[PDB]
Design a protein around this ligand. Sequence first.
Ligand code: NAG
Ligand code: NAG
Ligand code: NAG
Ligand code: NAG
Length: 376
Amino acid sequence: HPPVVLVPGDLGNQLEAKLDKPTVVHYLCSKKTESYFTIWLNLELLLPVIIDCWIDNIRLVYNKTSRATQFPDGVDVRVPGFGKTFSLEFLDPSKSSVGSYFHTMVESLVGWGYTRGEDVRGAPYDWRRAPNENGPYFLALREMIEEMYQLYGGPVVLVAHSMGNMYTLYFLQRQPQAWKDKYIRAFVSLGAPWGGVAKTLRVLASGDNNRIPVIGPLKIREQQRSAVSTSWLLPYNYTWSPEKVFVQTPTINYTLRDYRKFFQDIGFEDGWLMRQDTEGLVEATMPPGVQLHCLYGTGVPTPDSFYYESFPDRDPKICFGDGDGTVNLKSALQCQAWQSRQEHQVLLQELPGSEHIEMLANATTLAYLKRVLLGP
Ligand SMILES: *[C@@H]1O[C@H](CO)[C@@H](O)[C@H](O)[C@H]1NC(C)=O
Ligand SMILES: *[C@@H]1O[C@H](CO)[C@@H](O)[C@H](O)[C@H]1NC(C)=O
Ligand SMILES: *[C@@H]1O[C@H](CO)[C@@H](O)[C@H](O)[C@H]1NC(C)=O
Ligand SMILES: *[C@@H]1O[C@H](CO)[C@@H](O)[C@H](O)[C@H]1NC(C)=O
């Protein structure tokens, strides 16, 4: 069986931080730590009394002069577990079921004869950033793939979830065809948001706590805005119509041609700069150039557009289309376009009734992966 590399999505791996801050936002915030501690996922940091401390540490600072993000003064954030699986199997190192992410899939792989840290490895990254600020990650990923090829005696299968698919596409678009022909066996794409997702507009406008309900929406919005990866995933014109209205208000409509206005009107102008930094990273039409299995959920109501009475609106009204709850069905038309642009096969697989996250622990998903890996 071929070696496997797992690429997670947003919020999809542990992060650690170390502090030596000159100032804090309130007295209950720690100024200094002697060592690194887990900053994602640790439920104790997200209680109402101290969530402001967490926000202050996990936010990125946007520097308009350098057009780059930086950590807050006296904060360092690192990604543990590169080359291992623990930090994507469980988001919370307490190993609570709330943070179980790649665990079910890795358990299956091990049952089929894989070994953690050897022929199955994780490629975690700082998911707050877009690929433009994760150059070293891509170098390390390339090296790890080459090593795994040599050690385990054949080309590697990449398995990516959610935003990890866009990271993987970026990577593959930038490797020479000869390199991919040698080192990559296949790319199994799970819940890929090709061309962005409509719900990103609501996230940026009013916050989205559905994944972490112990955080109030307006509080978590601060983190979500600060993450370049959020703006990177706004809808693109190669998937969506330039005339589609994603956000409607009584006085103004926002389409994908109106992001500058949108960011002004929600009070977050840096987001427009982030979008400009990132909108060109993934080449709109260029296929990955490897055997591709596109697995996408359908039959789950998926936010498509929003009505706001103004900004900021406690409850926006929501219009739903088809998809997996998060990724709109239209994203899967992007894999269809690639069929005629590359020689390697592109296989589409619908997963009816499969929700965006649940697809990772779903027996049908795992049966499909087994077929890809073991051939039977
Ligand atoms: C912004 O970046 C510039 C150039 O890279 C640097 O001189 C400056 O220190 C940065 N600003 C802040 C507030 O750190
Ligand atoms: C597609 O969007 C990009 C910016 O993301 C833009 O440069 C290009 O002109 C657009 N294509 C259209 C409107 O046909
Ligand atoms: C957006 O506003 C335009 C105004 O020219 C309107 O015709 C259109 O119906 C609005 N949105 C939608 C989703 O139809
Ligand atoms: C597993 O995914 C299939 C679609 O492939 C879906 O029919 C089913 O509802 C899912 N099972 C669970 C337990 O969510």
